């Protein structure tokens, strides 16, 4: 007996002292110091300060730089938009709830928040995949005489959106569900309560297989092929210093992107998988945030990786930020 169940929540603290209140009614200061709530607040503040600009600036720049509006860039835009759902849907909310010490918006708030929060994350995630697929297609030319254009880019994006809804929407309608997670200030997919009227158990498998293993296998194969396609092209062009560099640089970028994709979702997956194998074993309200911490903060490093290091976007940002040019 480690949790306190409630009609709409799971407080990861034991009400044997009779102090646990609904995380929708009263501050959860008994499962974590008020200060740690502020630290939470602090971090949400950080993610908003950094996250908002980087992601907003991305869109903003695209509206102002013809060259950025190529269709091979849509998925990146998509990414930023997704990060923005994460900012306004997730971060700001939490910053706000965290400062009350509980989820002041109640069940439906939980649902809204959880939905937009997870929607964005999923979109972003699936973009990273879609992006991989596209580069694979474009660079490894696996298709006879195919040429990537606006329509693909569009589908590519639409797909992202679908996949996201394919995961965030079910909870809203009874396959799993959104409950206050961690310190009860943000809302998430219930992946740790065997709560059965919703079938969390299966859903989590669906999540784990479809929204983590598929992506991982696809992203791995794609960039694998790419880093092979480029490594090979260089071995066949050892005379061309650039091709050499390009190979070197693309490899480095892939290692970054992959390691980054892992840092972002491994935690969630790893934890989910553990919890799904080690039953009744309690997990603290803070430990339940570690995974969230890595995922949410991606809304900053993804744009750093996929946008700020992308040479064009960067030059554009610099130009814009410095009024004149470089």
């Amino acid at each position: 007996m480690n949790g306190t169940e409630g009609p709409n929540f799971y407080v990861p603290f034991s009400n044997k002292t009779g102090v646990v209140r609904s995380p929708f009614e009263a501050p959860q200061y008994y499962l974590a110091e008020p200060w740690q709530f502020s630290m939470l607040a602090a971090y949400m503040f950080l993610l908003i300060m950094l996250g908002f600009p980087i992601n907003f600036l991305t869109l903003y720049v695209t509206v102002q730089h013809k060259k950025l509006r190529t269709p091979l860039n849509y998925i990146l835009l998509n990414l930023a938009v997704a990060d923005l759902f994460m900012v306004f849907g997730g971060f700001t909310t939490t910053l706000y709830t965290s400062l009350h010490g509980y989820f002041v918006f109640g069940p439906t708030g939980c649902n809204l928040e959880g939905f937009f929060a997870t929607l964005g994350g999923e979109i972003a995630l699936w973009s990273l995949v879609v992006l991989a697929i596209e580069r694979y297609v474009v660079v490894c030319k696996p298709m006879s005489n195919f040429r990537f254009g606006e329509n693909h880019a569009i589908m590519g994006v639409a797909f992202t959106w679908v996949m996201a809804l394919a995961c965030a929407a079910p909870p809203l309608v009874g396959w799993s569900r959104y409950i206050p997670e961690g310190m009860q200030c943000s809302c998430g997919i219930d992946y740790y309560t065997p709560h059965e009227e919703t079938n969390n158990e299966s859903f989590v498998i669906y999540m784990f297989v479809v929204h983590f293993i598929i992506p991982l296998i696809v992203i791995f194969f794609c960039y694998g092929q790419l880093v092979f396609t480029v490594k090979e092209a260089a071995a066949q062009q050892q005379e061309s210093a650039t091709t050499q560099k390009a190979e070197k640089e693309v490899t480095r970028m892939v290692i970054i992107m992959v390691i980054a994709f892992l840092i972002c979702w491994l935690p969630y997956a790893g934890v989910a998988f553990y919890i799904f194998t080690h039953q009744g074993s309690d997990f603290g309200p803070i430990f339940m945030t570690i995974p969230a911490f890595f995922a949410k903060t991606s809304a900053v490093y993804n744009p750093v990786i996929y946008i700020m290091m992308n040479k064009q976007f960067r030059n554009c940002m610099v130009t814009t930020l410095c009024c004149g040019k470089n």
Binding site: L76, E134, L226, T229, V250, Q312
Partner: peptide
Amino acid sequence: ILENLKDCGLF
């Protein structure tokens, strides 16, 4: 493929 790499933001 430098061209396609520069198209993908990769190079």
